[PDB]
Amino acid sequence: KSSCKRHPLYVDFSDVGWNDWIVAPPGYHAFYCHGECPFPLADHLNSTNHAIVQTLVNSVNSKIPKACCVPTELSAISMLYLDENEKVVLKNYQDMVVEGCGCR
Amino acid sequence: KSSCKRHPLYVDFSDVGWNDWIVAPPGYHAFYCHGECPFPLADHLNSTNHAIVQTLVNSVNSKIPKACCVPTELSAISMLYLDENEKVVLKNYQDMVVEGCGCR
Amino acid sequence: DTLPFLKCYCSGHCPDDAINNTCITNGHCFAIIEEDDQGETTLTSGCLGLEGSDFQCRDTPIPHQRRSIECCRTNLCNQYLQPTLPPVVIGPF
Amino acid sequence: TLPFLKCYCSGHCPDDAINNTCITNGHCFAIIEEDDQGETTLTSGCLGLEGSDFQCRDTPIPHQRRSIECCRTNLCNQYLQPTLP
Numbered sequence: 459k460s461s462c463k464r465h466p467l468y469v470d471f472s473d474v475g476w477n478d479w480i481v482a483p484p485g486y487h488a489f490y491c492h493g494e495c496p497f498p499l500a501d502h503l504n505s506t507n508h509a510i511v512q513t514l515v516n517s518v519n520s521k522i523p524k525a526c527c528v529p530t531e532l533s534a535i536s537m538l539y540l541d542e543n544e545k546v547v548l549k550n551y552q553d554m555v556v557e558g559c560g561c562r
Numbered sequence: 563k564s565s566c567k568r569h570p571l572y573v574d575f576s577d578v579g580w581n582d583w584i585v586a587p588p589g590y591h592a593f594y595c596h597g598e599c600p601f602p603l604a605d606h607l608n609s610t611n612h613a614i615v616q617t618l619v620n621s622v623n624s625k626i627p628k629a630c631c632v633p634t635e636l637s638a639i640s641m642l643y644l645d646e647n648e649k650v651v652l653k654n655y656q657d658m659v660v661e662g663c664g665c666r
Numbered sequence: 667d668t669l670p671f672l673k674c675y676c677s678g679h680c681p682d683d684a685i686n687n688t689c690i691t692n693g694h695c696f697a698i699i700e701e702d703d704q705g706e707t708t709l710t711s712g713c714l715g716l717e718g719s720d721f722q723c724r725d726t727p728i729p730h731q732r733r734s735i736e737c738c739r740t741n742l743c744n745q746y747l748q749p750t751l752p753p754v755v756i757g758p759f
Numbered sequence: 760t761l762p763f764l765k766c767y768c769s770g771h772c773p774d775d776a777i778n779n780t781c782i783t784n785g786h787c788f789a790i791i792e793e794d795d796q797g798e799t800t801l802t803s804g805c806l807g808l809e810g811s812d813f814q815c816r817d818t819p820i821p822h823q824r825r826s827i828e829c830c831r832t833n834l835c836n837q838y839l840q841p842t843l844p
Contacts, residue, residue, distance in 0.1 A: 475818030
């Protein structure tokens with residue numbers, strides 16, 4: 459009973475394992491997507507045709523799931539870490555951060 | 563239990579009521595995505611980093627959802643449908659058919 | 667694409683950064699009346715994207731819960747929509 | 760970079776596995792998890808190159824005890840015996 463939106467989430471590395479393979483940063487703001495995909499999917503949910511069709515079918519046949527609230531735009535962050543040979547390395551990491559969310 | 567994959571769904575326009583504004587085709591194979599996104603995410607689920615990161619966060623903090631199983635490529639289909647003043651036109655609806663699924 | 671040109675009122679379906687209960691879109695304004703899972707009836711309104719709008723504005727006629735959606739395409743036009751529940755059906759089906 | 764490595768799989772197979780093997784550009788893994796009775800269970804398959812280093816690294820105190828080990832050699836994974844923390 460609240461719709462697809464982005465939600466805050468900070469991922470602390472020490473706090474989950476990778477304290478000691480990742481020199482920098484110690485964490486980063488990842489965000490995540492969650493919420494209802496109701497009928498009708500509004501404009502700001504950036505739905506596909508498939509998802510709009512599926513929402514209508516779910517409303518007539520409940521064995522077919524509703525669309526899911528998921529990231530529709532992600533961005534990169536770079537990290538400093540030590541690898542499988544253990545050199546200190548700078549690396550871009552793709553699709554780390556949720557920039558916006560939609561019903562897909 | 564069973565994990566993220568694509569599933570059959572045929573959408574028959576006249577069962578859903580659309581057959582008096584869609585002259586052709588009478589329906590089409592839309593499919594859908596559904597299923598688990600466990601840890602670890604195996605290759606064939608095409609997760610993004612974010613979905614990976616978040617699957618790990620969910621095993622430590624269950625207050626934060628699993629990655630979800632959604633379409634990751636979609637194809638188009640064309641249709642003959644009515645307009646406002648009862649003109650049949652042809653158009654290519656994007657993103658109607660699911661071609662593949664993933665954990666996102 | 668085709669840029670947002672339309673301004674609609676919203677209630678229930680407002681974007682999370684909506685200013686004064688309006689939203690903008692390249693699609694249609696809508697109003698919808700429906701029963702939820704408890705048979706409580708509610709009226710909500712907002713913006714629909716252009717892509718997919720044929721399906722959503724038309725609806726399917728027999729969903730689990732009664733509803734009616736209406737769409738219009740001029741500025742703030744959804745403040746005038748007064749959609750009403752479909753008549754109820756008697757007998758099993 | 761195409762897929763080039765062949766791994767065993769079990770529990771984590773794609774629907775089109777050939778004799779219980781998958782093909783990838785990342786790593787083969789195996790992993791042992793522990794349910795609610797302690798009656799545990801051992802699964803394996805393929806990990807995509809992307810984010811492999813997130814999934815191969817070992818993270819303490821989840822909901823459960825589990826351990827995962829990766830590698831990159833043909834069937835390196837069919838005789839990998841991870842042991843619980």
